[model samples]
Target: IVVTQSHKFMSTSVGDRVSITCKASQDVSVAVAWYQQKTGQSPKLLIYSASYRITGVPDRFTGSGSGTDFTFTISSVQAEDMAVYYCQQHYSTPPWTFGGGTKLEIKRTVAAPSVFIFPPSDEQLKSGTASVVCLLNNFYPREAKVQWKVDNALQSGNSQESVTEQDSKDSTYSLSSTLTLSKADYEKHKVYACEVTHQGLRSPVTKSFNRG
Candidate 1:
């Protein structure tokens, strides 16, 4: 059975109320379960049988509705409640189906990325290739795209990127992208650029590596 969660991203402030909806294609009765998953953590049961909260779950988290339409709501949003919510049912169908998770974020101000590019280390270049690292730090909102350019020409197949969310004390995120060039190309290219396009950025942040 198809389960749909239309809202892919939702945001709210502390002490606010937030509701996430999950609709099934057909009646699933009370055989539904809701889960909450935080970043870098495993999913935990929030509710089961539609409206029943799991043991030890907080009262602020409540489930309601039935059949084809179901809702999981936070009576009062808390910063610690920032996580993705998901619903699933296995009543009539033999196989359980889940709705697309809704990422519930705590509203915060957007901060631009601090961009920097580092040239390949001597030891790394000795391996017959030049590996450049692009660093984007303290950016609000995780979504970002990175492009590599060699002497004003965009490079192809550039997909090496990783992101690290900040600790509880920090509110922003950081990303790193690596680009590798062959020995011949590295020497031939005078400049390599790392360009980042992000939601927090007014314009793209670009940093360059000068081979000289």
Candidate 2:
């Protein structure tokens, strides 16, 4: 019986020292490896043989523990490093299995980012160029990725969030982004969507609509 650390929704923040542990049914003695996994990315081998960091891995990732108990530590945390991790036994006789998995959850004080699409007005629609605004609110950490799409086509536009201001009250944040669109595209009946990506969301936040 492998003893994987049962930590679901364990939260971590930037610069935090995160530690994870695992225990085996019996003494396997330094025959284990740890893996890090993120959405849409392949699993990364972080530690091997219970104590060695793989090539190309940063020094911040370290591992310890032999035989029955093992520990993995990250000295400094990065936002992108928030993901699910797994531990496996390589020295097993004929098979290797994974544990329930531990996820590096984010601690959020606010809700997920909400994007609102304000379409071009009829007057602006008549002009050669149209401007649309995407108002995002109620998100924590003040970090996000903003994307634009038209009729399912990926687009490029200028967007900037307000100077990041922390909410002294609840530690949440608020901001907005505005994208300029070509009226010609609007005339052709396009669906403009603002996709905001934050670490806390399982998927991107998108709001799309026509000139209605």
Candidate 3:
């Protein structure tokens, strides 16, 4: 039969539109279903043959018409929505096959620095022990690598934490890297950078914060 594969699966963020196509070796007129699975979670049925929805699924997750070019989509992706998705044909007897999997990831945006060593205001600068938490917005899977760098040098022994998606409909993952430097390091004008890498993207991206 025609074995389908996905080589360029793209990463996505919350509220971002995503579409993945599943092709069949033969016509899948009566035998195809799509499933979404997280790293350590069970699979959720998003669509079945003929674009039928399983019981208790929301309308945001939908599947279009079938053929060689069937499409599955999540109307608006949420934090909890990050997962590896697959399409399979359950029409025939045995030896069922699955389409290549597409993994969903959250998008990241820059955020304001939590603490500034040298504040725009003189009062803030006078305060001792300035600390900043770099919030990386819209990251998914909780598996993405996050690292902290100071003054272009990688920092060691920093505590990194992740928060799970609270909502079921828009389940997306988030993480934060906290950089704590002594008053001395702050005054020295260390450049702090937060880097994040994921399977869905072609290259890793970094967000840097400079204290001057």
The candidate 1 region of ten consecutive residues with least summed lDDT is 164-173
* Winner by lDDT between candidate 2 and candidate 1: 1
Off by more than 4 A, model 2: 1-3, 112-212
Q: Using TM-score, give the best candidate's number.
A: 1
* Winning candidate number (lDDT): 1
Model 3: which residue pairs collide?
2-25, 13-107, 79-170, 79-171, 79-172, 80-170, 80-171, 80-172, 81-171
Q: Where does model 3 exceed 4 Å of error?
A: 3-8, 110-212
**Candidate 2 RMSD to the correct structure:** 9.9
Cα lDDT tens digits for candidate 3, 81-117? 7778888877666578777788765545433222112
lDDT (10s digit) by residue, model 1, range 14-65: 8999999999888888778899999989999989998998779999999888
Pick by TM-score: 1 or 3, better one: 1
Error at 197, model 3, angstroms: 12
Model 2 lDDT per residue over 1-212, tens place? 46567675467767889988887887888988899988668899999999899889988889999998888888998776777888888776745767667877556564677667787777877768887777777677667777877777776645555633444345466777777757775667657888888877889878988655
- Please give the CA lDDT of all the candidate structures: 0.85, 0.76, 0.65
